[PDB]
Design a protein around this ligand. Sequence first.
Ligand SMILES: C[C@H](Cc1ccc(C(C)(C)C)cc1)[C@H](NN)c1nnnn1Cc1ccc2c(c1)OCO2
Length: 330
Amino acid sequence: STGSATTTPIDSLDDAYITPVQIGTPAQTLNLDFDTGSSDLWVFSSETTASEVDGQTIYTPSKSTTAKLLSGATWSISYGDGSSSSGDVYTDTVSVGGLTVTGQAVESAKKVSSSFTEDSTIDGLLGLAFSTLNTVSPTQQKTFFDNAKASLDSPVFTADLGYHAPGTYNFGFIDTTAYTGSITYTAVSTKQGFWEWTSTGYAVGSGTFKSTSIDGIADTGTTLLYLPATVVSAYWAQVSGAKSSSSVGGYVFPCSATLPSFTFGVGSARIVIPGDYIDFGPISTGSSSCFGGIQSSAGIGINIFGDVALKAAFVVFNGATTPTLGFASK
Ligand SMILES: C[C@H](Cc1ccc(C(C)(C)C)cc1)[C@H](NN)c1nnnn1Cc1ccc2c(c1)OCO2
């Protein structure tokens, strides 16, 4: 089997991406944030505290003839940005782009943090990291990809995110019309539960490439590119008037600037992020100071190849016996 679904930016800045997901019988369609850095599929629901719902579409398990309470099971997740959610668990039929899993764990939120309430466009998350990170207790549950894998034509999924435009998540096949050149594959460590790999270096604009190993994670659920402070300083030094602002929380730059590109290495191959992908707009409405899309990882503890990086590439998440990652230009 295979599946194919379109993923769409939630706003004009690509602050996150949503993908439609069918849950239950008859289908209830919710727009979820596919997150290759976490491993829980959770949704706003008829059980979510009423004051914490502000415009989201909810899953109502009592209206699904295939929903079953997973007795005794609970979940609770604390995301690294400070967001959180928790609740109870059902199993139900879940379909993405025509690919169906029966008996998928659907984690129903009873509580969500204010950041989730405030994003009316995001109805929950669909985790695509390794199932070792799943938070359900006392019986840990599998991700949508792990449940589907054995049925797929090939044990893979791909991310093709757009810049200020829609893109695609595919399951079970590699669309050879969706990229240029060849796909370069690179080793993955699953020891922390992430799609963790090592970039071979970077360049700023038309500058020379610096060979250096940068260990980090391929994370569709993170908006920006988080890299070591040395690398980030070298980038922003090329932008007149850019500075690190402790009050704003990162590097800012004049909205009048034209930004240089940023290149990262994948083996001997190179992925180029155009400068415009690094502009996240005014820090507050009407300001002429703009927020940068490349930021230091120093406060987080791991480097993160988030959407700013991934949207410049066609990315293969290869779930073979030994997992690997592939990157192509597009
Ligand atoms: C933050 C997301 C998880 C999430 C997604 C969306 C949202 C909103 C809908 C409310 C917009 C909140 C949360 C990330 N996913 N892998 C993640 N989950 N756990 N760690 N990370 C990576 C990290 C960690 C720390 C950081 C960061 C990133 O950005 C800024 O500080």
